[PDB]
From Swiss-Prot, chains A, B:
Superkingdom of origin organism: Eukaryota
Residues included from the entire protein: 251 to 284 of 284
Native organism: Rattus norvegicus (Rat)
Domain notes: The molecule is in a coiled coil structure that is formed by 2 polypeptide chains. The sequence exhibits a prominent seven-residues periodicity.
PTM notes: Phosphorylated at Ser-36 by DAPK1 in response to oxidative stress and this phosphorylation enhances stress fiber formation in endothelial cells.
Function: Binds to actin filaments in muscle and non-muscle cells. Plays a central role, in association with the troponin complex, in the calcium dependent regulation of vertebrate striated muscle contraction. Smooth muscle contraction is regulated by interaction with caldesmon. In non-muscle cells is implicated in stabilizing cytoskeleton actin filaments.
Modified-residue entries (Phosphotyrosine), positions: Y14
Binding partners and assembly: Homodimer. Heterodimer of an alpha (TPM1, TPM3 or TPM4) and a beta (TPM2) chain. Interacts with HRG (via the HRR domain); the interaction contributes to the antiangiogenic properties of the histidine/proline-rich region (HRR) of HRG. Interacts (via N-terminus) with LMOD2 (via N-terminus) and TMOD1 (via N-terminus).
Annotated S-S bridges: none
Modification type Phosphoserine: residues: S5, S24, S36
Protein name (Swiss-Prot/TrEMBL): Tropomyosin alpha-1 chain
Localization in the cell: Cytoplasm, Cytoskeleton
Family: Belongs to the tropomyosin family.
Amino acid sequence: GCGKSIDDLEDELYAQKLKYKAISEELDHALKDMTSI
Amino acid sequence: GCGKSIDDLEDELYAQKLKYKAISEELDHALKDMTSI
């Protein structure tokens, strides 16, 4: 075992990862779209 | 934190959470602050 719920951890984690990259991207792109005025 | 490499998991997790909301907001605000320049 781990301690409580590690499984759901890796799950929510991985998801948070793809969300962290999708967000980080959409973010940089969100600003890139506006270019450095 | 389990007993392998979950620690960094829970860390990156909770971080990804506060970072997810901090990014989401900082993002919207990042653009809101930018506005159609």
